Amino acid sequence: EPYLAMFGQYPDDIDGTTYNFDRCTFSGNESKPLCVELDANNQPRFPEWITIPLVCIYMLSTNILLVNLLVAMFGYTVGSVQENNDQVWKFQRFFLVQEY
Amino acid sequence: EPYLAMFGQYPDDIDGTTYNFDRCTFSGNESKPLCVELDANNQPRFPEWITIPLVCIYMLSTNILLVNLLVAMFGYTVGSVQENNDQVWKFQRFFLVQEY
Numbered sequence: 121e122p123y124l125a126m127f128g129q130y131p132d133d134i135d136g137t138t139y140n141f142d143r144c145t146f147s148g149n150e151s152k153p154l155c156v157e158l159d160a161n162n163q164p165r166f167p168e169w170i171t172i173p174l175v176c177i178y179m180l181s182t183n184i185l186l187v188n189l190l191v192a193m194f195g196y197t198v199g200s201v202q203e204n205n206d207q208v209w210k211f212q213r214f215f216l217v218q219e220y
Numbered sequence: 221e222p223y224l225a226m227f228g229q230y231p232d233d234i235d236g237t238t239y240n241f242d243r244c245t246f247s248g249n250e251s252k253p254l255c256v257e258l259d260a261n262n263q264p265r266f267p268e269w270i271t272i273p274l275v276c277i278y279m280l281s282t283n284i285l286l287v288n289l290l291v292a293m294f295g296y297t298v299g300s301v302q303e304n305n306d307q308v309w310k311f312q313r314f315f316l317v318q319e320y
């Protein structure tokens with residue numbers, strides 16, 4: 121579930137104002153992921169001033185502060201090994217002509 | 221709600237042709253966000269020639285004119301501090317060997 125958040129999922133209906141109407145079990149059957157811990161009031165116990173900025177920090181980091189970082193580290197690589205990749209490709213160009 | 225618009229939410233059902241069928245209260249209970257201001261005709265009062273290009277300007281800026289800007293400012297940093305980061309990493313490489 122945090123893996124799908126990198127392509128955009130953002131805790132779709134577990135992070136507040138989404139009650140126990142569906143998606144959850146309380147038991148362990150069926151294969152739905154089990155419910156939020158509850159109380160005598162049958163209220164969701166998670167504080168929601170913590171889980172909501174936790175997701176928003178994670179959705180900031182891995183979707184923006186991380187992927188967009190990967191472009192810069194990709195962008196330096198094409199800046200640096202480009203004049204070397206021509207010699208490397210011309211080197212392996214021999215083996216592909218050698219094959220016949 | 222504008223924070224989720226950076227990862228793609230785009231005012232899902234408040235920006236027109238989505239009436240008071242659900243999601244809203246008129247009162248202050250329950251925890252649903254309260255309704256659009258209405259009229260004697262019970263029509264949504266917001267002009268919708270203003271709120272729709274306001275979101276589309278915001279969705280243009282923070283999702284494209286802003287994040288893609290961050291890649292360029294990331295891309296200049298890996299272009300500039302790369303030859304300095306080698307000396308910095310080789311410098312802190314001493315303390316990690318010093319630890320034993």
Ligand SMILES: CC(C)CCC[C@@H](C)[C@H]1CC[C@H]2[C@@H]3CC=C4C[C@@H](OC(=O)CCC(=O)O)CC[C@]4(C)[C@H]3CC[C@]12C
Nearest residue numbers: 136166167168169170172173174176177180221223224
């Ligand atoms: C710096 C920027 C770029 C990051 C944006 C951070 C927000 C996405 C986070 C930080 C604090 C969060 C709020 C902190 C706690 C509240 C109360 C919370 O409801 C309660 O806990 C009820 C408590 C009570 O009022 O008695 C619901 C979420 C909410 C509005 C959060 C909404 C989203 C917020 C604004």
Ligand SMILES: CC(C)CCC[C@@H](C)[C@H]1CC[C@H]2[C@@H]3CC=C4C[C@@H](OC(=O)CCC(=O)O)CC[C@]4(C)[C@H]3CC[C@]12C
Nearest residue numbers: 235236266267268269270271272273274275276277280
């Ligand atoms: C320059 C490009 C890249 C930005 C694209 C801008 C559009 C996303 C915006 C600018 C003007 C907008 C329109 C301006 C006002 C109308 C009428 C509005 O309906 C009414 O207000 C009824 C008024 C009436 O006809 O009596 C509904 C949205 C709509 C179609 C908007 C649809 C989206 C639009 C085209």
